[model samples]
Target: MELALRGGYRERSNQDDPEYLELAHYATSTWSAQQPGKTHFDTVVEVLKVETQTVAGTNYRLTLKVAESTCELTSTYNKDTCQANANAAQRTCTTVIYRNLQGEKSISSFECAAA
Candidate 1:
C-alpha cells in the first residue's frame, strides 16, 4: 500500500472558487487511511505541485506523491502477496478520491494514472 500519490487532476467550474482546494484537502486526507482492520497497509500523500490552466474553464492539476508500507503483520507475509495487497490499497485510494471529486459539479473531470 505504498502511499505514493498516484497521478491525478481535476477541473474546477470556476476559477475564483476555492472548491478545488477543498477537493485537494479531501483527496489528501483520503490518501492517509491506513487503519489496522480497515487497511492492510499505511499510506500518506504529499502535494508535490499544483498547476492551473484556463482555456474554456479552469482546470487544477494536483500532482501528488503517496508513500505506503505494509502493516507489521502483512510485512511478514510473502513478498508477492504483500506487493499485491499494496497495489490493491493504492487502487482503492485512487478510486475513492476520484469518486469524491466526481460527486461535485464544480469538478468537471478527474483523471488519474500510476506514477
Candidate 2:
C-alpha cells in the first residue's frame, strides 16, 4: 500500500481537536474585529471541518459554528470560558489560515452565514 506523501495537503478529521482550536479562534477574533458595532458574541463554538495544506509553510481551512458568547470582545477571546448564548441563532463560518515558513500566522479570508 502506498502512503501519504508530504506533497501539499491533508484533510483533517479533528472536529473538536485541540490542535486547530487556537487557529480557529484567531479566525473568529479577526471576524469579530471587522464588525462595525463591535462584537459581543462571535467566536468558534465547534469546528465542523478542517484541512491542512503545505504551501510555503501551511494553510488551514476550517468550517465551524459561531455564536454569540458570554465573553467580552474588548478583552481576549477565550473559548473555554465563552459559553454560547442560548437564545442566539447560530452562524456557520468558513476561514482560511496561513502560516509562513517562519511560523507567522495570518488569516486569508472568512465568511459566515445563518445556519
Candidate 3:
C-alpha cells in the first residue's frame, strides 16, 4: 500500500463516529490486556474527544472516560456485553491507535488516571 503521508494532527468534530468508537473500544481492551494484575475489567464509558493524523495509514488519538465493568477480569472477556457499572467512578484515558500502511491496527500507547 502506498502512503499519501499527510502527516499532521487535527481534532475530530464527531467524537461518536463509528470508526473512532471502534478504536475507543479497542483501546479499553488493549489497556485491560496491558495490565499485569487487576480485579475488575476496565471498559470505555464514553468517548470525550478524538483526533487523527494521516501518516503511513492513520493515527487516531482519543480521550475517553472509562470505568470498571460489572464483569470481573479473567483470561478473556467480551467488551460488547460487559458494560461499566453505574456507581463506578470513571477515569480519564488517552490512547493512540495506529493503523499501518498494511492496515494492521494496534494500540500504540495509552494511559489512564483516577483523578
Please tell me which predicted candidate would have the highest TM-score against the true structure.
3
Q: Compose the digit string of candidate 1's lDDT tens values, residues 1-115.
A: 1112434343334345555445554443343343335444333343445555443333455554443445443344232232333353342223232222234323333334554
lDDT of 3 by residue, 6-90 (tens): 5567889643468787778877876776688767678888888888888558878889998878667664667678788689888
Measured against the true structure, the TM-scores of the candidates, in listed sequence, are 0.30, 0.80, 0.81
Which lDDT tens digits does candidate 2 get at residues 10-115? Answer: 7798754677978888778777877888657487778888988873577788888888776777877776787686787788998878788767777877888756
Candidate 1 pairs with clashing backbones: 1-86, 2-68, 3-66, 3-67, 3-68, 4-66, 4-67, 5-65, 5-66
| Residue 60 displacement in candidate 3 (angstroms) | 0.3
Q: For model 2, what is the error of residue 27's alpha carbon versus the real structure, in angstroms, after optimal superposition?
A: 1.1
lDDT of 3: 0.77
Clashes of 3: 0
Off by over 4 Å in 2: 1-9, 15-17
Of models 2 and 3, which has the larger lDDT? 3
Candidate 2 or 3, higher TM-score? 3
lDDT order of candidates, top first: 3, 2, 1
List all candidate RMSDs to the true structure.
12.2, 5.8, 3.5
